[PDB]
Structure 1
Amino acid sequence: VIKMVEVKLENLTKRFGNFTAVNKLNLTIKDGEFLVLLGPSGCGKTTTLRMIAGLEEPTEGRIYFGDRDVTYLPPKDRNISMVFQHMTVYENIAFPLKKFPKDEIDKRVRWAAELLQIEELLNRYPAQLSGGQRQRVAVARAIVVEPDVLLMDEPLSNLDAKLRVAMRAEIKKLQQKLKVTTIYVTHDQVEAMTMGDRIAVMNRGQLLQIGSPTEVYLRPNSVFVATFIGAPEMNILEVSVGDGYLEGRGFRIELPQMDLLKDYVGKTVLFGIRPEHMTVEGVHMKRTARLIGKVDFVEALGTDTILHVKFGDELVKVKLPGHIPIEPGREVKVIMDLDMIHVFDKDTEKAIV
């Protein structure tokens, strides 16, 4: 049976010569949670996964599994399984069983196969695997050893959009049934939001923020996090703070008695509001702000309609549900939800909100 193992990464650093790939990462991964490491290529998420697996050693720091320091233990002694990217399904799943009794091997294979709902493909071959998914087989093999920590590196990168969603759900439900601590690496924000109990956003080797999908989405602690999750991206506009309002290149926004910007009156800050947190007049929000503008372009995608509206000298995107192919040149009253607004220091790019 599977255990719930807490994982601690302490002052973990990894520098390949001159390049610091991971800079003093501090993370406490809760026993049984599904943690997604989200970030662009080269942000350090993969290097971190590899250090957790033991395929790579840290330059500094420690890695604990429970109370055991596993920093310098071979990957085999850490009780982990990694998923990434002529035997029968039964043999494929059996392979990883490493001095094992034939009767123990059969019990586990059956258990894993049932968990992945592939019991009926056990005597079938890969190339023949049509009645199921070779994807599901790979997962059963990863969990067949009953790892204390499950590690996955962009396991779904090469799958059709429709099958990818089905796999996200499949993997997530399986992990919630097993409660095996899982560290999942992806650069895909939608996948991250779909699978992680928590998400750890990384950029240039640093942990920018960790929290639940709701926390990182509704309350990004910085511009980078605010714009890495949710597409179309959050509108970021440079503005100046006044008596009790914001003003940018060709517009002003009446700020209610928010105004946690006192230490910014007279200074420039970055204003942010998501496309989906705005709407157009004639199409509820407790507190709002209006700004008339002309539609510069329309993405009428049927399922959603994205308007590129010129705010004064600026250009922002407004996301409307459904098909509303309004034409370019027309003027619209853009309505902003004041309760969904963000404000970031222009220098540090950290949220002031």
Structure 2
Amino acid sequence: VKIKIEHLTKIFGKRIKTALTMVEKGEPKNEILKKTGATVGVYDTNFEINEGEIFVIMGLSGSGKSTLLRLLNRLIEPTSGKIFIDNQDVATLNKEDLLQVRRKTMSMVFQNFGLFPHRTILENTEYGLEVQNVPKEERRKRAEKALDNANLLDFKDQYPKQLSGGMQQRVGLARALANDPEILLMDQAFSALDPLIRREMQDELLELQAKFQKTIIFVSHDLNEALRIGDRIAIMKDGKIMQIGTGEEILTNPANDYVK
């Protein structure tokens, strides 16, 4: 076991008290927003992620996926609940240990690619290594190798504004990989990729996990890839989990036309 999540909850806006009460009754998200304006990002999310596992997360746009990934990295704090990473509540971590965790344990990939315009690809790709005080030489080469795996080594000297959506997405992905952490949080890193390069990246991930038994959380909307690589799948709706199976979801499901 690598990660635990217990009664995790994060509610945005204000009037959080009445909204939390409403969900405690079990009212839907839209009515709660109508009364209070507080959009329940995620409610009573409780589960476990083991090591060397591609925990794919899936759900409707507006179901609380990116929020969960952010909470795991504690970029935002929940209103109620506990996130344990190696038997260590991230909310009870002093800045130094949190920093070591964010550098080595887990690295994140965003929907918007979180890219620095003022830095080339080779300087964004090795940002996660500069902060670790890695020398110029090894980090330079690790970034180059990651880009070559992502088919961007010819653009290493260019800037993001000189690039498209797919190449920027691959840049974010490589920046996450170059750091070679023990956990890879990934929020739709394949949304803007062609099938061929998408499958290249899937094979990349499978190789990584096979050799380096490495935890990966992979948000996705494509059923095909989740089944191909997802050793375990979690489906979300309106901020709550509905099933956390691997391949039985296609056989047994509570009104999941999501699959068909």
TM-score, reference length from structure 2: 0.71
3-state secondary structure, aligned to 2:76: coil
| Equivalent residue letter for 1:228 | Y
Q: Which residue of 1 aligns with 2:153?
A: 121
Deviation at 1:149, TM superposition (A): 1.9
Identify the structure with bigger relative contact order (alpha carbons < 8 Å, sequence gap 6+). Answer: 2
The answer as to 2:202 corresponding to 1:168 is yes
- Indicate which of 91, 97, 101 corresponds to 1:78: 101
Mapped contact 2:208–2:214 kept (Cα < 8 A): no
Mapped contact 1:54–1:72 kept (Cα < 8 A): no
Measured against aligned partners, the alpha-carbon deviations of 1:177-224 in whole angstroms (never above 9, x if no partner) come to 332211111233223223311101111222111122x2222x333122
- CA distance in 1 between partners of 2:11 and 2:243 (Å): 21
- CA distance in 2 between partners of 1:120 and 1:84 (Å): 19
The answer as to 2:75 corresponding to 1:44 is no
Change beyond 3 A, Cα 1:176–1:136: farther
Q: How does 1:171-182 map onto structure 2 within 5 Å?
A: 171-182=205-216
Q: Which residue of 2 aligns with 1:190?
A: 224
Q: How does 1:1-353 map onto structure 2 within 5 Å?
A: 6-16=2-12, 17=16, 18=19, 19-73=39-93, 76-79=99-102, 80-85=106-111, 87=119, 89-96=121-128, 97-98=130-131, 100-102=133-135, 105-111=136-142, 113-114=144-145, 117-118=148-149, 121=153, 124-126=156-158, 135-212=169-246, 214-217=247-250, 219-224=251-256, 227-229=257-259, 233=260
- CA distance in 1 between partners of 2:193 and 2:182 (Å): 27
| Equivalent residue letter for 1:31 | E
Deviation at 1:7, TM superposition (A): 0.9
Which structure has the highest helix share of the two? 2
- CA distance in 1 between partners of 2:155 and 2:197 (Å): 24
Change beyond 3 A, Cα 1:135–1:47: closer
- Provide runs of 4+ in structure 1 moved above 6 Å: none
Q: Which residue of 1 aligns with 2:26?
A: none
Which structure has the highest strand share of the two? 1
3-state secondary structure, aligned to 1:31: coil
Mapped contact 1:88–1:122 kept (Cα < 8 A): no
- CA distance in 1 between partners of 2:224 and 2:122 (Å): 33
| Equivalent residue letter for 1:28 | E
- CA distance in 1 between partners of 2:40 and 2:222 (Å): 23
Q: What are the ranges of 5 or more consecutive residues in structure 2 without an aligned counterpart? A: 20-38, 112-117
Question: Once the two structures are aligned, what percentage of the paired residues are identical?
Answer: 39
TM-score, reference length from structure 1: 0.54
Mapped contact 1:45–1:185 kept (Cα < 8 A): yes
Mapped contact 2:6–2:45 kept (Cα < 8 A): yes
Q: Which residue of 2 aligns with 1:278?
A: none
- CA distance in 1 between partners of 2:229 and 2:140 (Å): 25
Q: What are the ranges of 5 or more consecutive residues in structure 1 without an aligned counterpart? A: 234-353
Change beyond 3 A, Cα 1:113–1:178: farther
3-state secondary structure, aligned to 2:91: coil
Deviation at 1:21, TM superposition (A): 2.4
| Equivalent residue letter for 1:163 | I
Q: How many residues align?
A: 219
Deviation at 1:116, TM superposition (A): 6.0
- CA distance in 2 between partners of 1:101 and 1:174 (Å): 22
- RMSD between aligned alpha carbons? 3.1
3-state secondary structure, aligned to 1:47: helix
Deviation at 1:115, TM superposition (A): 5.7
Mapped contact 1:6–1:32 kept (Cα < 8 A): no
Moved more, 202-211 or 141-150: 141-150
